[PDB]
Amino acid sequence: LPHFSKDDYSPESKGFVENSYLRGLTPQEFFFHAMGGREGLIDTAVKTAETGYIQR
Amino acid sequence: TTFTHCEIHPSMILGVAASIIPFPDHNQSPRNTYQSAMGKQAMGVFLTN
Amino acid sequence: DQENERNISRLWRAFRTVKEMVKDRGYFITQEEVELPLEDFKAKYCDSMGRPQRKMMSFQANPTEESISKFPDMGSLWVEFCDEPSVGVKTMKTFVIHIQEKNFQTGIFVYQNNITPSAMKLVPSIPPATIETFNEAALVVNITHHELVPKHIRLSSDEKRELLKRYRLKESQLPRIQRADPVALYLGLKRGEVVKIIRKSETSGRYASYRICM
Amino acid sequence: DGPTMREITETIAEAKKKVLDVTKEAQANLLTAKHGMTLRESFEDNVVRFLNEARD
Amino acid sequence: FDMGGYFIINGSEKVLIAQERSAGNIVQVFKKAAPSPISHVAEIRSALEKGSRFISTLQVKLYGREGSSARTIKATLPYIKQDIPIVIIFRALGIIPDGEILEHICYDVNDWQMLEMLKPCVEDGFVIQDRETALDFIGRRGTALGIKKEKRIQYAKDILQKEFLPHITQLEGFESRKAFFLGYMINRLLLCALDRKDQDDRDHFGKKRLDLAGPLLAQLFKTLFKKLTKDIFRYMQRTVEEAHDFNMKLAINAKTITSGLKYALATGNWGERAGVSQVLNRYTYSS
Amino acid sequence: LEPGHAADQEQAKLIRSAIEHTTLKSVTIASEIYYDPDPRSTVIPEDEEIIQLHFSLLSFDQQSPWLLRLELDRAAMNDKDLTMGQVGERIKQTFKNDLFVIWSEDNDEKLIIRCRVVRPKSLDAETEAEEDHMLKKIENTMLENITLRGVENIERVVMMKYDRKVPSPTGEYVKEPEWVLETDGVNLSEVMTVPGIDPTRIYTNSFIDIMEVLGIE
Amino acid sequence: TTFRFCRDCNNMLYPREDKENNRLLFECRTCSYVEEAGSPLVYRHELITNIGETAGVVQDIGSDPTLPRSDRECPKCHSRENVFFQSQQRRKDTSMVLFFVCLSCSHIFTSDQKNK
Amino acid sequence: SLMSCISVGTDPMPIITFLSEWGMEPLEDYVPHQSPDATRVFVNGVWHGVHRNPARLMETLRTLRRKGDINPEVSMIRDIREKELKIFTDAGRVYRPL
DNA sequence: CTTTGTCATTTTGCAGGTACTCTTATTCAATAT
RNA sequence: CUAAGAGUAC
DNA sequence: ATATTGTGCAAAATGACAAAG
Ligand SMILES: [Zn+2]
Ligand SMILES: [Zn+2]
């Protein structure tokens, strides 16, 4: 993200969410979690199509 | 400490539908996506005329 | 000389696998010849200089009593090993005429690297004699000892007829096994012959299948 | 309760310290690559393992 | 509370969805798959806003895998049936000496790796040592196949002036600029092939553009008005050939523009893409 | 591995070296071509010792002045059981007498391989000009076309410690450890015959190879 | 490799064998310009390349606000402040060693240990 | 996003004139050997020339855009490592305020 | 001289299952009877 | 009626 | 005035082509 310096491999830089849902997420953690959820949804769609064809 | 800009507000990264969610940072992201999709199907008053 | 040592070791392993193959085919081979140690093989089939010799390595086998009772139509068998890396047409011709004049119905030719295609065309000789070619590199390891490979037993014509009668099957309704399958080549299967397969099954202890050579 | 939250924070901090130590070793090039993978792959594997066991 | 931003076509509220595309006039270098003989491809989707608005895709390709020895770079010029070697293009534009071409491509004397990777190209084009010769070589490859032997040069010139890198310029006397741009593209490709930079990310949002109502209606109306003016020219030619009188009212068919715009906005299909125009959602204000 | 040598870690290392495919590309740090007018004295000081051994131990009048020099890696020679003698012998075998090859000793600070193309006695008025190109081509193939050790299609081999169930002599089943080899790439026919391994228990993901090697069952 | 160009027609120069003196000689392929070879080396091929890791260093690299800062010792100024970044060679197997530029003297020093 | 906007595009001629006035060396008489450490200036993907003091040029361009002389939609990027300066004024670019 | 295996092209057929709503459009224009 | 397209539910 | 006509796998199949007798 443009909120981090270059070449930052620290856990918070590359998507570690140290806060719980009870505490709430910082904006960077919120975006990274959004990316993870997006990957999940995309995988769901692709998976259902492919598995339907394989099952047939 | 070498900043060149500052975010006006982080909550402005959300869109129109996601800006309705209360405490969106205390939710699992797919739930936010579901609510963003499902609020367009909410029943209200679309126009006063 | 490490190349020579590895070559002679591979040749010994190939010899052991060939003996096992011939014994499994139903011929009379004693278990002692099968388990011949490396030092004995080196003493016997290798010259003083250290180069193994193949001409005296070739041998003959004959059917056992049980095979004769079950298969009263198959006589003696000849196994030959070639010396030169590439087998010429003249050598194959000598082998086939030797097989024909000795009245061997089966002859296994074990070659080093390859066969000239002009020698392949004359491999099918006048029946009932059959010629089978094997590469030494493919015979270094006996595939049938793999735990994935179950037990293959060739059936007699009477057994095949009984099987087809009892299961009401036609020729095409049996599971197939290609006449190039490594186990089929190992057992010398021919088209129309059925092999009974005994398998370790995890639902019932033993399961018997059958495959017809196509 | 408060003591458990404090212990959780301490665990997260210790994991972040271990990640920082591994990062220092990698930056000093003192980290040796696990056989079958590159240096960066081994570093990423170690960091992910540490963070996962920290969350656990 | 109504915010506007939509059209009323036949009493229906129609909204134009912003169409995403890749930006033009940006050099993008991509690694190719192992089976293909080309390892890296540097391409630009050149376009000019104040012109015919036509898309010409130039590609610079590096033949040969990493282990291969004959690594020659070839460019794919428009209206040409073969991938011309880059040095032939450079000599055609007017840069004869090998040193000048290499200077146009590589900007550092110490970067001997790039020079080593670039030697095969000049060895390939060693057989041509003249601008006219290179122009003839390109013209021979010309797919038009309607040019005499002497005018091939001019044909090649035309292709290099009005089809090669249109976004730079359509005029003449800017051969140096186009040669510099080609050297820049080759430099980018070689940087990607020398593992000095990663292949360009196709998903980087700064490399994308959104065509809104403005540009969509712009290109639609450009096509439709070109149709109308072609009709005007055809009518004028017909009436002058037949000696009939000329009338503007019978010349212009306003139904052309009107019906074209109304059809494009009433149904999503944007032409003569789909779903470009959609019925505005009025279930809820946030919707 | 062979049941008697299942736990022998160094035997597993030996097998791993035996089957893993290795090429000069994974060993050579760099390659160069020099102009040495005589194949008796070198214009490079660093490798002078090499020649003043080999030529002293040792024909040379029909050798091209162009020399191909390969600089190898100490770490490459360490993580893989390779030595200068082995690689020199492999190059010599694969290129016959057409290429005179010398190499530095392993204990030397730098690993250097020097090669020269033997000139045929027939005169060549144009091949001399392209000799460099020819050497380049040779160097190219020497980088990838020859194999030092291992069998083809085996990109990388890793060693793992599995724990199987073995019936103990007293009667129970015990958790016996075992050294097992995982391999990227499949060359089942060539791997299965390698001595020291258990030919019976070899297994592969690619059931196509299993079918074409072992049988339909 | 340090290639050189002809000074007559600005074309490439290629190596050539000599018979009278048995020496390497660089020649032009179109105008026949001839000169001596500075070094016997005529071809270099880097399987493992070390250059390009510090590429892009400029006198104003410190003006970049995206680059991270550090207080590590400069072994020419003993100054604290400097900028740092990882290796620029984008090969997937490169090491994670860091490079540092002092904003006062512009000396590039690494965080490696075996090299030191 | 709530504060995201799409540029509508502007004529790049004034910016080209600014660049020419402020020291942008024309591409026609550019010889890389005599100017090795020169920043390449791009406008809408068209390499227009090189500059020898990119820091001052970026400073004055930022000042001009901040006072309204340059249209605010114009985007100006300076890649120090690649020694490049890109300016984009075309339409369709999505931007946000900061 | 003809194989012979071998790569590099060409085809070429496919791409989950139900279900709901709405919107537009059905060849344009010139000629001859 | 037919066709095409768009949006949507699980 | 109106009817009539000017897409990305990935397997299979196929063709071109340096080596072999
Ligand atoms: Zn010259
Ligand atoms: Zn300093």
Side-chain angles (χ1 to χ4, degrees):
Chain A
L1 280 175
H3 312 83
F4 300 105
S5 284
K6 299 250 188 76
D7 301 315
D8 185 359
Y9 289 88
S10 65
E12 57 265 15
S13 166
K14 288 188 80 89
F16 181 66
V17 186
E18 67 185 308
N19 290 301
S20 57
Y21 287 129
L22 175 69
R23 272 186 179 171
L25 275 60
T26 69
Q28 303 99 327
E29 295 171 351
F30 180 87
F31 197 74
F32 300 143
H33 196 36
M35 295 172 74
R38 179 72 64 78
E39 193 201 10
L41 300 177
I42 294 155
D43 169 77
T44 288
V46 171
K47 168 182 77 174
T48 177
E50 287 298 332
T51 43
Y53 186 31
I54 296 169
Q55 205 262 348
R56 176 170 192 275
Chain B
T1 57
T2 184
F3 295 109
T4 58
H5 300 82
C6 177
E7 293 277 347
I8 299 181
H9 201 269
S11 64
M12 295 283 102
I13 66 180
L14 299 173
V16 158
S19 297
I20 303 310
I21 296 154
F23 295 118
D25 53 326
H26 301 257
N27 263 350
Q28 214 195 358
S29 45
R31 300 288 143 195
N32 295 339
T33 299
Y34 293 178
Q35 168 46 30
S36 308
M38 199 149 49
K40 305 161 191 153
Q41 306 165 359
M43 193 187 299
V45 185
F46 64 93
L47 284 177
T48 47
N49 72 334
Chain C
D1 60 356
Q2 290 296 100
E3 63 90 26
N4 185 77
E5 273 301 320
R6 71 176 295 276
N7 291 326
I8 188 159
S9 190
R10 289 171 74 71
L11 183 59
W12 169 57
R13 295 146 73 72
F15 193 59
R16 179 191 166 88
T17 56
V18 169
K19 287 290 188 64
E20 280 166 334
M21 173 193 290
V22 172
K23 189 176 183 293
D24 291 331
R25 281 197 196 203
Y27 294 79
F28 179 55
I29 303 294
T30 187
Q31 175 64 29
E32 290 77 2
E33 283 193 350
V34 166
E35 60 92 23
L36 186 84
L38 168 55
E39 55 89 15
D40 281 337
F41 162 87
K42 193 145 47 47
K44 184 177 288 186
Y45 301 103
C46 185
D47 60 19
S48 52
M49 286 66 77
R51 309 300 84 90
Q53 54 273 22
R54 273 68 173 265
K55 291 190 288 296
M56 61 95 72
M57 199 165 162
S58 175
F59 76 100
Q60 173 183 359
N62 305 292
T64 191
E65 316 302 351
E66 289 74 1
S67 86
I68 283 291
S69 66
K70 196 190 277 187
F71 305 136
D73 49 348
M74 47 93 77
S76 289
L77 176 158
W78 181 251
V79 177
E80 191 87 30
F81 302 80
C82 198
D83 278 286
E84 57 272 18
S86 182
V87 187
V89 170
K90 279 74 170 173
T91 48
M92 184 64 74
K93 191 159 65 172
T94 47
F95 174 69
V96 62
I97 62 179
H98 172 274
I99 290 301
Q100 186 176 6
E101 65 88 6
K102 292 307 310 308
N103 300 120
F104 291 134
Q105 76 279 17
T106 59
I108 296 89
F109 194 70
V110 191
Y111 58 92
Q112 303 286 287
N113 292 129
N114 60 277
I115 308 299
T116 59
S118 59
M120 278 288 107
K121 49 167 57 53
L122 59 89
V123 162
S125 169
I126 301 105
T130 55
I131 305 297
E132 300 170 354
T133 68
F134 283 96
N135 181 358
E136 281 192 2
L139 285 174
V140 176
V141 168
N142 210 45
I143 60 170
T144 71
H145 291 342
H146 207 304
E147 70 273 15
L148 289 179
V149 177
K151 185 66 180 307
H152 294 59
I153 309 294
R154 187 164 60 101
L155 290 195
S156 65
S157 296
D158 291 337
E159 272 163 342
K160 182 173 88 168
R161 182 176 300 107
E162 181 70 5
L163 172 79
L164 298 179
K165 165 178 272 195
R166 297 321 183 177
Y167 281 114
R168 309 287 182 83
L169 297 160
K170 295 189 290 185
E171 207 79 352
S172 56
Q173 285 176 332
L174 277 168
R176 277 78 168 268
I177 182 170
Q178 280 161 345
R179 193 216 303 115
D181 193 76
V183 179
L185 296 173
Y186 177 93
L187 286 182
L189 266 286
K190 296 184 287 298
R191 82 175 313 287
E193 299 206 89
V194 172
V195 290
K196 173 168 172 177
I197 317 310
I198 295 98
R199 263 190 303 182
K200 309 290 176 49
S201 172
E202 83 186 22
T203 54
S204 64
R206 212 187 318 296
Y207 179 61
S209 179
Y210 302 94
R211 275 185 196 275
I212 189 153
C213 188
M214 285 307 207
Chain D
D1 58 343
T4 304
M5 285 323 294
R6 168 151 43 260
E7 289 185 1
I8 283 158
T9 313
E10 183 184 4
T11 293
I12 299 302
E14 196 274 357
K16 291 170 75 69
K17 178 263 288 177
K18 287 208 294 192
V19 167
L20 177 59
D21 290 353
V22 167
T23 307
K24 291 286 178 66
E25 295 289 315
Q27 289 175 356
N29 205 356
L30 300 170
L31 181 66
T32 187
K34 295 178 174 65
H35 198 295
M37 53 174 71
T38 78
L39 276 173
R40 289 182 180 278
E41 282 186 353
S42 316
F43 167 83
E44 279 281 299
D45 180 67
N46 285 336
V47 169
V48 169
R49 184 180 65 249
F50 287 141
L51 297 177
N52 274 341
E53 73 182 5
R55 182 200 62 205
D56 283 324
Chain E
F1 289 112
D2 195 15
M3 65 303 279
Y6 54 96
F7 308 81
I8 300 172
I9 313 302
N10 287 331
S12 285
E13 294 163 318
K14 293 288 197 297
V15 63
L16 289 169
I17 313 307
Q19 300 296 306
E20 196 203 305
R21 61 171 171 83
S22 66
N25 311 337
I26 46 163
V27 184
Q28 284 182 315
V29 193
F30 300 119
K31 292 178 189 290
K32 268 289 184 67
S36 76
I38 52 174
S39 63
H40 306 70
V41 180
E43 67 185 2
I44 179 164
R45 187 175 296 281
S46 184
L48 71 167
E49 180 50 32
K50 304 295 186 181
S52 295
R53 293 180 181 177
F54 77 105
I55 303 304
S56 68
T57 301
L58 174 61
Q59 303 187 354
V60 184
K61 306 189 270 197
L62 199 150
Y63 284 87
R65 311 306 310 198
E66 185 66 23
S68 180
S69 62
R71 307 285 283 292
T72 60
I73 310 172
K74 294 183 191 175
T76 298
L77 283 73
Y79 298 149
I80 302 294
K81 66 182 179 66
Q82 283 176 354
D83 301 333
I84 305 301
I86 56 165
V87 65
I88 289 178
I89 305 305
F90 263 99
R91 274 168 186 159
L93 273 298
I95 301 92
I96 310 305
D98 303 341
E100 282 193 318
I101 298 178
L102 298 179
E103 187 180 26
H104 275 51
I105 296 167
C106 181
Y107 314 117
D108 193 313
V109 298
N110 303 333
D111 191 325
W112 65 262
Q113 282 87 359
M114 200 179 285
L115 275 300
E116 291 275 20
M117 190 170 285
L118 209 44
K119 293 305 185 187
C121 312
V122 55
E123 297 295 327
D124 183 3
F126 166 79
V127 298
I128 293 170
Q129 295 282 328
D130 169 62
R131 158 169 202 171
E132 203 275 356
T133 304
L135 293 159
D136 191 19
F137 181 97
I138 298 167
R140 181 62 57 81
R141 272 71 179 165
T143 198
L145 308 163
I147 310 100
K148 63 202 72 49
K149 303 291 101 179
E150 60 260 29
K151 299 317 185 156
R152 292 289 171 78
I153 305 298
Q154 213 60 63
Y155 176 74
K157 282 191 77 61
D158 294 339
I159 284 292
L160 296 180
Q161 193 198 147
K162 312 185 190 178
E163 307 304 331
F164 187 71
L165 305 185
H167 78 278
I168 294 173
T169 185
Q170 302 281 93
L171 286 69
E172 57 277 19
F174 302 95
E175 285 79 19
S176 62
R177 289 173 94 86
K178 291 192 177 185
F180 267 110
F181 198 87
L182 184 68
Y184 168 80
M185 276 184 91
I186 293 150
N187 193 73
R188 288 277 305 278
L189 180 78
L190 295 182
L191 286 178
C192 187
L194 287 172
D195 299 333
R196 304 188 186 183
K197 284 197 166 67
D198 280 331
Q199 51 164 313
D200 287 314
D201 188 339
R202 298 168 155 288
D203 315 304
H204 195 283
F205 203 65
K207 267 79 185 183
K208 305 289 186 65
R209 300 289 187 273
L210 296 179
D211 300 325
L212 272 293
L216 294 173
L217 283 176
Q219 65 85 30
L220 177 76
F221 183 90
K222 189 249 193 175
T223 287
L224 203 58
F225 181 70
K226 193 182 284 291
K227 177 67 173 296
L228 179 138
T229 191
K230 182 177 74 175
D231 207 308
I232 296 286
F233 180 75
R234 189 223 50 67
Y235 164 91
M236 187 173 59
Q237 180 178 358
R238 192 261 292 158
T239 184
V240 70
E241 289 169 353
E242 307 296 334
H244 308 339
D245 201 298
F246 180 94
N247 182 7
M248 286 69 72
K249 293 183 176 301
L250 273 78
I252 56 175
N253 187 34
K255 269 65 70 177
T256 288
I257 300 295
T258 289
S259 298
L261 291 177
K262 275 175 70 171
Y263 174 79
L265 285 158
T267 66
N269 45 4
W270 211 246
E272 87 170 13
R273 287 171 293 180
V276 172
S277 171
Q278 299 177 1
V279 185
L280 184 62
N281 204 352
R282 289 282 204 192
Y283 200 88
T284 297
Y285 192 64
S286 58
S287 163
Chain F
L1 310 199
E2 205 278 330
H5 313 284
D8 204 79
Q9 208 272 0
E10 61 270 353
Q11 200 256 336
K13 285 273 201 169
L14 288 175
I15 284 163
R16 200 272 300 285
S17 72
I19 67 177
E20 178 163 37
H21 200 243
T22 61
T23 50
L24 284 176
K25 186 185 284 188
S26 53
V27 189
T28 60
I29 283 175
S31 72
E32 286 163 342
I33 299 178
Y34 289 82
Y35 184 83
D36 272 330
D38 74 318
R40 279 85 173 269
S41 62
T42 186
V43 308
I44 297 97
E46 188 272 349
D47 61 355
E48 203 285 329
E49 64 93 12
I50 307 163
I51 58 166
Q52 71 101 15
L53 277 71
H54 285 71
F55 159 62
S56 67
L57 277 170
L58 269 75
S59 286
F60 299 173
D61 294 329
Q62 57 275 19
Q63 287 183 357
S64 77
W66 298 113
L67 179 135
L68 165 52
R69 193 186 171 196
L70 279 73
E71 301 77 353
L72 314 180
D73 191 312
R74 177 69 265 182
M77 289 294 180
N78 284 330
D79 55 4
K80 298 188 284 292
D81 309 337
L82 273 297
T83 198
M84 302 298 288
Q86 283 173 349
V87 61
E89 286 298 328
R90 290 292 293 112
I91 300 155
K92 192 182 285 294
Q93 188 172 7
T94 186
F95 286 170
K96 279 72 68 172
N97 52 346
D98 285 357
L99 188 77
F100 170 80
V101 184
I102 58 172
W103 50 97
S104 65
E105 298 79 35
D106 187 73
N107 48 8
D108 298 3
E109 61 274 351
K110 287 185 182 176
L111 314 165
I112 307 297
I113 291 165
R114 289 162 69 82
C115 316
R116 289 177 198 263
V117 166
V118 302
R119 296 292 306 151
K121 311 308 296 181
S122 67
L123 273 294
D124 317 309
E126 66 285 342
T127 317
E128 297 287 333
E130 71 210 353
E131 266 176 0
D132 198 0
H133 195 72
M134 191 66 203
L135 194 58
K136 278 191 202 184
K137 189 262 178 184
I138 291 295
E139 184 264 334
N140 167 256
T141 176
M142 210 172 65
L143 275 183
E144 61 270 10
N145 185 64
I146 71 177
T147 294
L148 306 186
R149 59 163 74 270
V151 311
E152 290 286 318
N153 302 117
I154 301 308
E155 308 307 329
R156 184 259 313 296
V157 186
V158 65
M159 186 187 297
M160 296 293 289
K161 170 67 78 185
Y162 287 135
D163 188 49
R164 71 186 290 211
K165 306 278 281 200
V166 184
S168 169
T170 182
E172 292 94 0
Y173 268 99
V174 292
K175 313 299 300 311
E176 167 158 344
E178 267 203 349
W179 282 118
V180 168
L181 276 51
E182 274 78 350
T183 293
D184 296 337
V186 173
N187 192 356
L188 174 61
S189 59
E190 299 298 331
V191 171
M192 188 172 46
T193 175
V194 171
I197 66 169
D198 199 350
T200 71
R201 296 176 67 212
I202 190 166
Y203 181 70
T204 310
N205 289 140
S206 178
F207 51 88
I208 296 162
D209 293 304
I210 289 279
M211 188 274 289
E212 79 198 359
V213 171
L214 296 179
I216 184 56
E217 286 289 320
Chain G
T1 310
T2 75
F3 286 133
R4 56 182 67 86
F5 295 95
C6 172
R7 89 293 190 276
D8 174 18
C9 49
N10 219 33
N11 281 316
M12 62 85 72
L13 302 170
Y14 85 114
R16 163 73 80 186
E17 185 90 42
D18 207 352
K19 299 289 102 181
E20 47 260 26
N21 296 114
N22 194 0
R23 73 181 197 287
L24 175 63
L25 200 66
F26 271 104
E27 183 194 327
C28 200
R29 296 176 66 194
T30 184
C31 84
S32 80
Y33 164 58
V34 182
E35 84 290 8
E36 300 297 335
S39 64
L41 177 61
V42 298
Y43 171 84
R44 175 74 157 167
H45 181 32
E46 293 280 324
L47 277 294
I48 295 93
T49 309
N50 176 280
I51 62 155
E53 58 191 7
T54 46
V57 64
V58 193
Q59 70 279 354
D60 62 349
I61 193 165
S63 59
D64 189 346
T66 66
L67 284 174
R69 305 296 227 264
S70 190
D71 60 354
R72 179 174 281 94
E73 191 94 23
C74 174
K76 259 172 55 48
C77 307
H78 305 73
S79 303
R80 299 287 83 73
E81 54 80 10
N82 63 353
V83 301
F84 76 84
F85 51 90
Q86 63 99 29
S87 174
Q88 291 298 318
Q89 189 178 185
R90 283 284 179 279
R91 297 183 68 250
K92 61 182 76 64
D93 55 355
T94 184
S95 184
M96 296 178 91
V97 187
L98 293 182
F99 297 90
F100 300 77
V101 190
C102 181
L103 302 184
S104 66
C105 75
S106 72
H107 174 62
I108 300 94
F109 55 103
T110 187
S111 74
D112 220 345
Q113 302 288 37
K114 273 80 73 174
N115 165 76
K116 297 180 181 183
Chain H
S1 289
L2 276 186
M3 295 188 87
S4 71
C5 318
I6 301 103
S7 71
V8 301
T10 60
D11 180 50
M13 293 295 112
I15 293 159
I16 298 171
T17 292
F18 278 126
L19 293 168
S20 279
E21 185 270 1
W22 281 108
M24 185 174 76
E25 179 176 357
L27 197 60
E28 286 76 1
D29 63 355
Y30 164 55
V31 188
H33 284 121
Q34 284 68 12
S35 294
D37 55 0
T39 294
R40 315 186 278 288
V41 183
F42 296 70
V43 182
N44 291 357
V46 176
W47 186 3
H48 273 95
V50 304
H51 208 268
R52 275 199 204 68
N53 200 234
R56 185 177 65 243
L57 187 68
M58 270 304 311
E59 185 163 5
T60 179
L61 292 168
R62 275 174 196 157
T63 305
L64 283 174
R65 185 176 68 178
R66 280 166 184 181
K67 80 177 69 174
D69 285 12
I70 298 174
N71 191 232
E73 286 187 353
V74 176
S75 71
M76 307 172 293
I77 313 99
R78 161 150 184 262
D79 189 354
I80 293 158
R81 309 298 298 282
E82 190 46 283
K83 291 193 285 293
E84 274 176 6
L85 164 48
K86 304 181 175 296
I87 299 176
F88 294 98
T89 76
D90 56 340
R93 291 173 296 103
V94 187
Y95 59 85
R96 69 212 191 84
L98 289 166

